[PDB]
C-alpha cells in the first residue's frame, strides 16, 4: 500500500465490566484519564452485555485482570500494562504498532 | 418515504458516568439488564470523556439524575423513566417513537 497508518484511524476501546466491582470501575477511571490525557478518544465495551467483546478478552488477554485497552479487534494492554507503557513514554507505540 | 422504521436501526446508548459513584454504576447495571432482557443492543457513553454526550444530556434530560437511554441523538428516558416504561410494558414505544 503505502506507509499509511490507518491504525491511528481505528476504534480504541476500554474493555471493562460495570459488574466487576468498585476496584475495576476505579481502575477504569484511571485508564480513561491516561487515554484522555494523551489525546486518545475511546469508547467503553461491557463484557456483561457484549458477547463479541468477552470473546476478544478471552482469546487475547491471557486472562489478565480488570480493564484494558483494545484497538479495533486487537488487544493492546490492560490497566497495568498501559500504566507501564505510559510511564515509560511508550503508549502510542503499544497502541499503534500492534 | 415509506413506513420504514429505521428508528430501530439506530444506535441505542446508555448515558452514564463511571465517576458518578456506586449508585450510578449500580443503576447502570439495572438499566443494562432491562435492555438486555428486551433484546435491545446498546453501547455505553461516558460523560467524563465524551463532550458530545455531556451536551445531549445537557439539552435533553432536563437535568434528571443517574444513567439513562438515548437513541442516536435523541434522549428517551433515564433510569427511572425506563424502569417505569418497562413495568408498564411500553419500553419499545418510548424507544422507537421519540
From TrEMBL, chains A, B:
The organism's place on the tree of life at top rank: Eukaryota
Protein name: Uncharacterized protein
Originating organism: Candida albicans (strain SC5314 / ATCC MYA-2876)
Name of the gene encoding the protein in the UniProt record: AIP5
Residues represented out of the complete protein: 799 to 895 of 896
